Design a protein around this ligand. Sequence first.
Ligand code: ADP
Ligand code: ADP
Length: 657
Amino acid sequence: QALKKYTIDLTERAEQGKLDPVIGRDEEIRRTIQVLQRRTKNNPVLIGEPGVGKTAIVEGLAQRIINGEVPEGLKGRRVLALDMGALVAGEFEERLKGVLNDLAKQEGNVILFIDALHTMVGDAGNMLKPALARGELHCVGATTLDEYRQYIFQKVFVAEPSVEDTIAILRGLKERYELHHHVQITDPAIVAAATLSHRYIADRQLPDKAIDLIDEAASSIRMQIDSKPEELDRLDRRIIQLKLEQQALMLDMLNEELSDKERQYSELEEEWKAEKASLSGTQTIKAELEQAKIAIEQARRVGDLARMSELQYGKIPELEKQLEAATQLEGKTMRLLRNKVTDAEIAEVLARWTGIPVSRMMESEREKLLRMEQELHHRVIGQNEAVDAVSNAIRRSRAGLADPNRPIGSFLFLGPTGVGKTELCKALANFMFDSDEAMVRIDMSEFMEKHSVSRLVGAGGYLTEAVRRRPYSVILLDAVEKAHPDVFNILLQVLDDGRLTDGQGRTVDFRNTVVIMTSNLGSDLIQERFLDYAHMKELVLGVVSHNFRPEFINRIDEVVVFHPLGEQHIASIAQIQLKRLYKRLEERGYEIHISDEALKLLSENGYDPVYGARPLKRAIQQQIENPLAQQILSGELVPGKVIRLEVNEDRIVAVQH
Ligand SMILES: Nc1ncnc2c1ncn2[C@@H]1O[C@H](COP(=O)(O)OP(=O)(O)O)[C@@H](O)[C@H]1O
Ligand SMILES: Nc1ncnc2c1ncn2[C@@H]1O[C@H](COP(=O)(O)OP(=O)(O)O)[C@@H](O)[C@H]1O
C-alpha cells in the first residue's frame, strides 16, 4: 500500500465533490480517453506549457469516470496522482518498486498520473521501463514539450485557451472561488482578469495567470473586509484626542461634543457588527448550498430516492432563494464593507505586478483614438499625411470595419532618411502599446539569404519568438526591398492569416500587432517632388510596381509617403530634442532658454538632405551638452540662475546674465 503513502486518489476526491469544475477541454478529454483504451502504446501524455490546465484535464477525466460518462471500459477505474514529494522524504528506488507492485496488483483498474513526467525518467528512475511494455502499469503523463523533446506513449497536445475560453473557464470556477474567498466576484472582473493578464503578463500563461489575478484581488478584498473601517478609526482617534484635552483641562462644551461623538461612534460600531453578521450569514448558507449540491451528486451515484427530489425541489432552490435574498440584503445593508471584487481590483493587482500606472490600463480608448493625430503630433513633427493615413487605418481596424484575422495595421513607409519614419513607429508603439519598448525592430539588410528566411522563422526564429513574448508590439521591417524572396511569402502569410506557423509547427498570433515596412526606393522621386499634395502616391506607385507584386500593394492598408523637412520643421525637431536636456536640468534647478539664432545654428548643423535630421541629436550633444557639462562641473554655472544659450562668434555659448 505505497499508494496510500505515495499517491493522491483523484477519483476519490472527485467522488467527494472536492475537485473544482472543469470547463471546456471536451476534445482533449475525449482524446485522452480514446488513447487510454489504446491497443498498444495506450497510455497518453499531456504536453503543454505550465498553467494551461493539463492537470485540469486529468481531474476532468476523473470526474467523468465518477459520473459514469466514460466508455464501459473505463467505468469503475481509479485515477491516482503520484506525488514526487513523498518519495524523496536508496529509499527512492525501493518505494517506487513497491508502488509498481501495488499498481501491478489490481492489473488495470488503476490509472497512474505523473506530473512533470521528465523528473521520474530523465532523477531518471530506470525501473519504470519494464512496466510500460509488460503492461503492469497504465499511466498518463503531464510534461512540457521541451521535456518531451528530452524524453523522445502517445502524444496528446494541450493548447493554451484563448481569452474567450479563459472567460468561460473563470465563469465556471466563479461560484467555487466566491465560496473559497468569502467574496463576490464581478463578471467585469472576470473579463478584465483574462484580458489584462493576456495583454500585460508576457511570461505566464492562460488561464493560470488570470486565475492568479482573481485570487490575489480576492485576498486583497478579504483583508479589506476584516479590517476596521476608516470612519471608526477616525472617530476613535478624534474622541481619544478630545478625551485627552478634556481630562487635561480638569471646559464642559467639549464634554457635550465628546458624548455626541461617542453616540455616533457607538452607532457606527454597531452598524459595523451588523454588516459583518450579514456577510457571515451569506457565506454560511452559500457553503450549505454547495454541500447540498454535492450531496445530490452523491445521491445520483448511490441511488437514494425521495432524497434527490427533496433536494432538487426543496433544499437547493430554497437555499438559492435566500442566498440571493441575502445578497440583495447585502445590497441594502452593505456600506462600510465592500465584498465585491471588480475590474478595478484586478487592475490594482496587475498594477502591483507590472508597474503600469493603471490610469493607462483603463484610460478611455475612444478618446485616445479620436484625438490620435494630436497625440502622434506631440512627438512626430510634420508629416501630416503619414499621421492621417496611420490614424485612419488604425481607427478603421479598432472600429471593427476590417478583417479581424489580419494585423491591426499594415503600412509601407516611403521617403528619404531622417524624416521621422522610425519616429512615427516609436510614437505608435508608445501611443497604443504604452511604450517604445513594445516594438520589434528587424533590419531586412541582414536577411538577404535562404539562411534569412531560416533565421527569422526557424528550421528559434528572431520574429516568432519576439511576437510570442510580446503579442502587442509595433513590428518595424526596415529596408524591406533588400529582403530575400522567400521572406516576402512569410510576410504575406502574416498580412493575411494574421498568424504565422514557425519551423516548430506552432502558430504565432500577429493580430495584435501593427506591421510597418520602410523603403528607400521612392526616395529620389519623392525628394524630386514638391507637384500636388496628392498625385505623389500615383507617381511613386509607378516605382512601387517595379519591385513589388500586386499582392503586396493590395494587402497593405496604406502606402505612406514621407516628405523632406522644412526649416521650421527642423527647428521644432530641435526644440523637442532640447526638451529632455531641459528636463534633466530642471531637476537640478537649472533654467535654460535658447536664442533664436542659436536655435538656427543647431538647425543648420543638424540637417543635411541625405541623412535628414539624424545628425541633430549628437549635433546638440557636441555643441551644447559638452561645454554645458564643462561649466556645470566648473561651478561657473550655478542653479537658481537662468542659463541663456547664445552665439559667440559662430559657436554656441552658455551664459548667466
Ligand atoms: N478547462 C478548465 N476548467 C477549469 N479550470 C481550468 C481549466 N483549465 C485550467 N484550469 C485551471 O488552471 C489552473 C492551473 O492549471 P494546471 O492544471 O496547473 O496547468 P498545468 O498542470 O497544465 O501546468 C488550475 O487551477 C485549473 O483549475
Ligand atoms: N518628423 C520628425 N519628428 C520628430 N523627430 C524627428 C522627425 N524626423 C527626424 N526626427 C529625429 O531624427 C532622428 C532620426 O530620425 P528617424 O526617425 O530615425 O529617421 P528614419 O525613420 O528615416 O530612420 C530621430 O531620433 C528623431 O528624434
